[PDB]
Amino acid sequence: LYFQSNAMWESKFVKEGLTFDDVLLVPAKSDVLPREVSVKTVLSESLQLNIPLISAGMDTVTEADMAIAMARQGGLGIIHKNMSIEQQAEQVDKVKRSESGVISDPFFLTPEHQVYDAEHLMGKYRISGVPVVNNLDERKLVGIITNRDMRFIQDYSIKISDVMTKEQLITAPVGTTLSEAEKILQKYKIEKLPLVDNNGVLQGLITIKDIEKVIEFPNSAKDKQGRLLVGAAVGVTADAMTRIDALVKASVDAIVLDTAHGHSQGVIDKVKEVRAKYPSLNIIAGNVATAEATKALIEAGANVVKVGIGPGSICTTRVVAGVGVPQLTAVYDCATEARKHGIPVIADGGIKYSGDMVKALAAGAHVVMLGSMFAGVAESPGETEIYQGRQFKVVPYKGPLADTVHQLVGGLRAGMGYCGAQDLEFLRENAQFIRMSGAGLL
Amino acid sequence: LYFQSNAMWESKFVKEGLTFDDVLLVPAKSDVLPREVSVKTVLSESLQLNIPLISAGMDTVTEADMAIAMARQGGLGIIHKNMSIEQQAEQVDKVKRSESGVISDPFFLTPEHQVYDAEHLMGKYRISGVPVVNNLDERKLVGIITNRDMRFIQDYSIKISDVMTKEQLITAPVGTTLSEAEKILQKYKIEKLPLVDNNGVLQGLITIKDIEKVIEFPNSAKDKQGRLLVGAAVGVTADAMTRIDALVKASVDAIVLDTAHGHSQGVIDKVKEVRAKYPSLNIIAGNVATAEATKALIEAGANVVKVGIGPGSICTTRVVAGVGVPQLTAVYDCATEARKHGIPVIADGGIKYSGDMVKALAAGAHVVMLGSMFAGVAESPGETEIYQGRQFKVVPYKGPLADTVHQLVGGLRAGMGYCGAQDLEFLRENAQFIRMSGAGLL
Amino acid sequence: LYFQSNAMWESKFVKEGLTFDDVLLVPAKSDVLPREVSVKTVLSESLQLNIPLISAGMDTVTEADMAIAMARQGGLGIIHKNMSIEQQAEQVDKVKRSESGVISDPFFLTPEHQVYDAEHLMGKYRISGVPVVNNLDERKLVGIITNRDMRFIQDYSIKISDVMTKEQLITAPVGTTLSEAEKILQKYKIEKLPLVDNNGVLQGLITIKDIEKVIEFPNSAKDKQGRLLVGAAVGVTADAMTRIDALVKASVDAIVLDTAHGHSQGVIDKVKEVRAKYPSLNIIAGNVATAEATKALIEAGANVVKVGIGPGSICTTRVVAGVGVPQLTAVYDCATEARKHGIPVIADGGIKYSGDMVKALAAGAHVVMLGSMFAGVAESPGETEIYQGRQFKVVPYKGPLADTVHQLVGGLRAGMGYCGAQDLEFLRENAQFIRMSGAGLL
């Protein structure tokens, strides 16, 4: 009575899937050394990473310090949502203002503010000077209070007019760039360069640190104005939009609309809704494990699709619900769909060693997301303690993020050398795998 | 000389089968939240469960206390056969009379009975009042002896005429329902409501507990008269019928005709025989692992087929006899046959975690049976002891049945959310699996 | 230039094979209870076993005591070749004469022999009487010296004429059978019945033990004259024939021409040679693992083919030489060839539990051979000691052979019940397997 009414019944057991340990990458003809290989990857025009790594949006993984360390390495951190909306937008603000933060949109105080406000702004952003203007209306620059002024201030409750030295200031015009500022800073022997207009109105501030961080971290992943990229997690809930609004106002570069099952009508509706209010916002949506789910999220408006159901190290999804797809099959199936739209995928979960990362990228993902490999690095949230004669996060202490990133990227370049891939696109398009038994694993 | 005489020889090694750890369920488009999902399942018109769980017919698993706890949770207990016929029918009687038990067919005493008979009836059924009638012939209600009367009785050997307070009784008519009784009980401030006819003849009794248990356990699996469902195990033996007769007279809702190999002529004959004497009796017959065995038991008259040979945790069948079928293949093969007849299957054995249960239902079973997951819960038979600083059953103590059921059902709803299944029928019909290697398990 | 010159190169990796843990037997419709099932199997007209078990021809497994215990259970022992030719033929002689041994071909002494010769013959055969005749020429019976005569003899160096009581003897005629003898023994109240002809010439002896052992072991595997069956191992070497000659003269029922690689021209030549000198001798030849090797040994004249290369528990063949075939594939491939000739196969090696035995028979073997499962039973060679608070063979002590056989056969009957097999032929012809993953094993 119905065409192939028994089709769904008969296909129950047909699909097979492969995980990382089921395969190896086959060496191919290579003209390129691992060090000359390119690890850059573009998630979109406004998200351009210099290494294909994202730190997960978990409370044991990414807050502002992690997001800053990641972007400095060329990757992207995703600030977790296990805090209030204001706290999350503030975390975003700290990443965006870490460097090149106040060049076009400076903070400032009047002489009538207390030295407390200076300590607050310098503590909050880790910027060592606060411009001072005559009043909040004209905003004419009368001076600056710096970390060096604070050396001599005992009580902080006093007016800034009291403590402010009236000294000859060096200013530069609006539009002064970093490399120009570096010369002006070198010339007059100063660490701070307020930018003003023709009327003496403060438009901006450049610091020696804005210049030093460019040198210290040449691989930083930055926006068009030179500020570190940052993402932020958002749940699918009634208040998602309120949360997104505050993040966008804090100048977040991407939101991750994250849920256990991305293939639900609620998630699709939420992406449609966020896409409509914000045509240009980078929307990473997940989590999905099928070609059909990938197509639905893309057509709802997601521009990055996040892949993985069940592979996560601490996910009970497989044991409790019986649900999952082996991660390489999931990445490959989703990338097969997403390729047709020009849409990149993130491989989220189940990565143990750098080799797994190489495999995930070779199976078609543009980028991998790591929680557990990053949870013990120094910049992750949570305190250090010594307990077993061992330093711990309160999980084994891994040291600075940079050491872990360096090993991951080293592994990736090696893998790329073997596969003859000069860049990640060639790797996704061309790399071949060979399947092996469990005996082939040992 | 014979058509395909070598066919049986050549097919020896052809079949493959899959067990729980060989597969995962694939997420599908979902419009439905895990909490709004329906876990109800119908085994037949007279057996309707509110969660798809049955407690096994083993002496370490199910006696009256377990059967009562299970049915209260919405499932079904199967009283084991490792006791005498009278003991088993009595166990059945206790479950059926746990609540709403005496509404149409009350127990009663005369004034000439001893208070011992009252203690016995109240102990046996956990019902706190015993109606008293003038004589066994007219059965005219003269009073009631309750748990509160017993507070003041020291010696129990005395006549009930001595101890019975002559007090104004409140009675209601035959056909009074629970929700009516609740109002009458509230109004006159009483805990017991004998039901009588126009001549004062006792027809029944309702208690506040009959009303309270409906509220306390809104998911109870009950018969048409509001009594807890119960099953009972029967062996295939010469005295099976004698045993079945007593169980049916005790108002059992199903019998499980249980044997190691259900595919034997003796079992088929026994089902034919029981079906013939009792056209309406629910007959669960097992155990089978093939489509052919399923068809034979169905045509013999079984209305539920029990599936599993060798997967049971304590079965030596695989090691000793070399025999078995991987449980998901068994469930699927049997359900493929049983679907054609509109007959449900029970997946019996080999379930470790809730995920396995989700998989068994997704492979086509209507219901799973669990022995070992239930053997340590409080309501299972056997005493508590402390031994290793650990509470034990004399096996690790799992606490109340309700805690274990809550985790199982939580896992099931999650799995159903992932698969987009609003109800168990959709799950059986539509859920897809993906096969994975042993590396995909880790 | 050559037809398919690359065929051998391209087929290198094509074959797959299965071992015991790769499969389970599928239950089939059964009309037959495990206890009414027949476990008999015929290796040839002159070798008919009552259980399908053979004890291996290893020095830690089978000497006369083991061979006797095995045949009593219905199986066959194979006396190992790690002794001299005379020692091996003597071991064979002890098995054949264990019961019904001296009925047609008696030992005897004259009065001039010492009591030492009586002790020797009674010790050697465990027969408690020695017939005495007047001289080696007439062989006329003058009396008998028994275990009871020995009670009173202190010095054994004396002439038998001295110690022999002249007492009225009861004799029976030649051709007297056991059941007749039992009545004559009961009637005259005696334990020994010499058989003589019309002239008083000793032809034979029957003892109460010949009669008692028939009752004690109703399943004994016996030859046409009522003596226990026994086999013996022979190597392929220059002196094989000399060894075979002595075994045949000792009335061995089978020889096992045993070598690591049975598929060699030397083995085939040796079978051809032994077949030619002894047209009726049972020749078990091995070891082979392929259909082609099975055909070659059969056409060389072997009437039983022994199967297994590498599965043996203590074989290093797989690790050292890299060689082997998974045992069930080997059994099946060899049985496929051997079936065409009406030739039975023995599955030798790799059996751990009774389930494996059921599987080997279901894959087509008529009989399984066990070394390591038997090496600790009481009747195996080697002394008992207590060492770790544990009794040991000098390997864990398993107790009497009968206990191990009873568990094996119990497992076999169960398996046969499940498969609906009334006899081993039906099992070989009809049993089906299902393949499972390593996850299906756990």
Add this chain to the structure above:
Amino acid sequence: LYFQSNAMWESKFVKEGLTFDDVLLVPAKSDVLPREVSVKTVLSESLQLNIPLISAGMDTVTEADMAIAMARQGGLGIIHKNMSIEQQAEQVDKVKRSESGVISDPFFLTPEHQVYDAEHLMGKYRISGVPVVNNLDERKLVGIITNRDMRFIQDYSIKISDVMTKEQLITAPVGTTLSEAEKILQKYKIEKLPLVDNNGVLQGLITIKDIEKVIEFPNSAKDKQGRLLVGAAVGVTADAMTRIDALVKASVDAIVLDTAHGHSQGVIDKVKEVRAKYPSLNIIAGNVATAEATKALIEAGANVVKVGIGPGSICTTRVVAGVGVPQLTAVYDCATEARKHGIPVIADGGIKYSGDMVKALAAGAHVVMLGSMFAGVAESPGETEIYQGRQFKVVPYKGPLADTVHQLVGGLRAGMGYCGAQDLEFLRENAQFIRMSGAGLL
């Protein structure tokens, strides 16, 4: 727009590969005993081995003592490159001059040299005599200083003219062979036989040791002039040629141009370049794991191809880069290509037991290379120490190379017996494998 533009994408997961534990060799008809089997193998006309074993070019495996022990056993050692060019050529020189070293191109001293130079030459080569000539121009033999002369010399700083006994010397002509020399040495009762021309000019030296070593090691792998074969590792680097030049001048028999990824344009260019400068030099090039890489190295001019990426015991290649091919598939795929050119392959890495070696040769390699199986033998580099009550290399001490070689070759002959292979060519061409599950491994 492009023919099969999606082909590379769709083939990603198609290949399967097998490692040693995935398979066993199938026994085949055999006419040949393991001891009469030939284990010889030809890598080229100028490299002819008597056992198919090469010791790896690692600093924990092969220096001069190892290379000498290996060639004496019939195999080939590869001197590692983790030393300077001069040190490596010197190591090569010691192997080539170990025996038959000075027959055509002798070292010599004048009377004006110190006894220090004699000690040096005798220490360096382990040759117990140094010819002495009148001057470096005529090179007329005036005498010889031997190990026996040194017994009486206390101070070594003295002129050789002082210490040299003027004694009647026995000389033989140029072209005198070893077997001739043996007779002359026996006849005149001497241990040293200088070879001279008609004018008394030293052309050469034969020692009793040159003769004794032929007897002691009848299986030595030697060049055309009777000197032990030796190989040497070279990296692909700017100074490779400078290194190769010195090795060729030291009369190396092969170079191994060794790199992690042999399939790179740099390696191919380097082979082309070395092939062009040295048309006759044996070039072993690696490492490759594919048919395409094998063809490229062969056409670049390599005459031996080395196979294996990732199987090496201490390689992190699989875990770190995610790259590799299961070793038997790699050997088979490469041998399939190399067969077409008449080119042999070396199976490098992943060999644990002798069985694995048999499998690698049966999959098509002419020879296996072993690092880790040899790293603890006595002749490997590094000191002995006792630490845990255990002798160690500073890794468990394996004793003399000869003991390990004897077990490997024993395993190989056994495997060859089973496969019916009289020689390694037949094994490569004809041996068949059977695939097994992980359950078939246990």
